[PDB]
Design an enzyme around this catalytic site. Structure first.
Site, PDB file in Angstrom:
ATOM      1  N   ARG A  29       0.862  -1.172   0.000  1.00 59.37           N
ATOM      2  CA  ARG A  29       0.000   0.000   0.000  1.00 59.37           C
ATOM      3  C   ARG A  29       0.903   1.227   0.000  1.00 59.37           C
ATOM      4  O   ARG A  29       1.796   1.338   0.846  1.00 59.37           O
ATOM      5  CB  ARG A  29      -0.920  -0.010   1.221  1.00 59.37           C
ATOM      6  CG  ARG A  29      -1.685   1.291   1.440  1.00 59.37           C
ATOM      7  CD  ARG A  29      -2.549   1.585   0.227  1.00 59.37           C
ATOM      8  NE  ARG A  29      -3.573   2.590   0.493  1.00 59.37           N
ATOM      9  CZ  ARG A  29      -3.426   3.899   0.317  1.00 59.37           C
ATOM     10  NH1 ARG A  29      -2.303   4.451  -0.125  1.00 59.37           N
ATOM     11  NH2 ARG A  29      -4.453   4.692   0.598  1.00 59.37           N
ATOM     12  N   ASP A  34      -3.707   9.266  -0.858  1.00 58.48           N
ATOM     13  CA  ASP A  34      -5.107   8.966  -1.084  1.00 58.48           C
ATOM     14  C   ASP A  34      -5.398   9.265  -2.563  1.00 58.48           C
ATOM     15  O   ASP A  34      -5.470  10.429  -2.934  1.00 58.48           O
ATOM     16  CB  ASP A  34      -6.047   9.741  -0.172  1.00 58.48           C
ATOM     17  CG  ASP A  34      -6.306   9.008   1.134  1.00 58.48           C
ATOM     18  OD1 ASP A  34      -5.868   7.842   1.266  1.00 58.48           O
ATOM     19  OD2 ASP A  34      -6.947   9.604   2.024  1.00 58.48           O
ATOM     20  N   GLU A  37      -9.812   5.536  -6.166  1.00 59.23           N
ATOM     21  CA  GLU A  37      -9.723   4.077  -6.228  1.00 59.23           C
ATOM     22  C   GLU A  37     -10.400   3.533  -7.483  1.00 59.23           C
ATOM     23  O   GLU A  37     -11.358   4.106  -7.993  1.00 59.23           O
ATOM     24  CB  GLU A  37     -10.306   3.421  -4.975  1.00 59.23           C
ATOM     25  CG  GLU A  37      -9.257   3.225  -3.883  1.00 59.23           C
ATOM     26  CD  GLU A  37      -9.718   2.314  -2.766  1.00 59.23           C
ATOM     27  OE1 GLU A  37     -10.269   1.225  -3.041  1.00 59.23           O
ATOM     28  OE2 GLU A  37      -9.525   2.689  -1.588  1.00 59.23           O
ATOM     29  N   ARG A  81      -1.138  -5.605   4.171  1.00 59.59           N
ATOM     30  CA  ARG A  81      -0.325  -4.942   3.153  1.00 59.59           C
ATOM     31  C   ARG A  81       0.889  -4.243   3.750  1.00 59.59           C
ATOM     32  O   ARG A  81       0.742  -3.603   4.798  1.00 59.59           O
ATOM     33  CB  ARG A  81      -1.178  -3.910   2.397  1.00 59.59           C
ATOM     34  CG  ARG A  81      -2.269  -4.558   1.574  1.00 59.59           C
ATOM     35  CD  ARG A  81      -3.245  -3.569   0.997  1.00 59.59           C
ATOM     36  NE  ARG A  81      -3.873  -2.626   1.909  1.00 59.59           N
ATOM     37  CZ  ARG A  81      -4.628  -1.618   1.467  1.00 59.59           C
ATOM     38  NH1 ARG A  81      -4.822  -1.447   0.159  1.00 59.59           N
ATOM     39  NH2 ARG A  81      -5.191  -0.766   2.311  1.00 59.59           N
TER      40      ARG A  81
END
Length: 135
Positions: A29, A34, A37, A81
């Site tokens: 990750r 951010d 997605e 992750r």
């Protein structure tokens, strides 16, 4: 912070890549970003999500050298992750994405903030140039 070699296995999304790290496959990750997605549980594909995924994908696919850099905080999330900075031929993917306006600087998780300022700077620049998500 130490960079370690890894090998690309597969890019999964703008913010997630699968690497061979110290012999085993592992999902990473990207720390402090951010990203729209594409494999978003709810809402699904988002605005710029496909573009962020293509960018990440292209950057690691064409790299001769992939390196992973853990920060000094917690090193994995609740889904197992790895939480890291990924480098493609010495260039930080996390930074590239923000600089290109294809991601925002996420909150600092569990003490992982070594490159936070470097990234907030990139993000200011992309904001001033009205890039992609700041269009």
């Amino acid at each position: 912070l130490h960079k370690e070699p890894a090998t690309l296995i597969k890019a999964i999304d703008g913010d997630t890549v699968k690497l061979m790290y110290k012999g085993q496959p592992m999902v990473f990750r990207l720390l402090l970003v951010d990203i729209p997605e594409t494999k978003h549980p709810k809402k699904g594909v988002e605005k710029y999500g496909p573009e962020a995924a293509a960018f990440t994908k292209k950057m690691v696919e064409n790299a001769k050298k992939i390196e992973v850099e853990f920060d000094k905080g917690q090193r994995t999330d609740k889904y197992g992750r790895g939480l890291a900075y990924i480098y493609a031929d010495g260039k930080m993917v996390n930074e590239a994405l923000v600089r290109q306006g294809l991601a925002k600087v996420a909150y600092v998780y569990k003490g992982n903030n070594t490159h936070e300022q470097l990234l907030r700077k990139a993000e200011a620049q992309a904001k001033k140039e009205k890039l992609n998500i700041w269009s």
